[PDB]
């Protein structure tokens, strides 16, 4: 078990029983809960640098709900429990993503 951080088998499109990978979704997110941040924020997760994208502006007005790709569910879940894990100061109420929403490439 836990090959990377908490990794499973990586047997689906990237681990089994997932939309694709490891569904995590930043929601109600404050200031710049984004690629590199999310990756190392909950250090210990196989969070892909930039399988994440906050609905932002050029300024970086992250708000509604953002995309987060985790190579396996466990990793994904360590962050699907990430409710109220701000950056800046707003309840990061993460959702169990649909990888569908998630990424943009």
The CATH code of the domain that includes 29 is 3.30.70.330
Rounded CA-CA distance 48/105 in Å is 13
Rounded CA-CA distance 97/105 in Å is 16
Is there a contact between 69 and 48 (Cβ–Cβ < 8 Å)? yes
Method: NMR
Enclosing domain of residue 28: 1-105
> How many domains are there within the chain?
1
Is there a contact between 86 and 28 (Cβ–Cβ < 8 Å)? no
Rounded CA-CA distance 83/87 in Å is 12
């Amino acid at each position: 078990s836990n090959a990377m951080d908490w990794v499973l088998k990586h047997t689906g499109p990237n681990s089994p029983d997932t939309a694709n990978d490891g569904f995590v979704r930043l929601r109600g997110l404050p200031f710049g809960c984004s690629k590199e941040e999310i990756v190392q924020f909950f250090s210990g997760l196989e969070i892909v640098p930039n399988g994440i994208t906050l609905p932002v502006d050029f300024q970086g007005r992250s708000t509604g709900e953002a995309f987060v790709q985790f190579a396996s569910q466990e990793i994904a879940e360590k962050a699907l429990k990430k409710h109220k894990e701000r950056i800046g100061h707003r309840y990061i109420e993460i959702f169990k993503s649909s990888r569908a929403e998630v990424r943009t490439h």
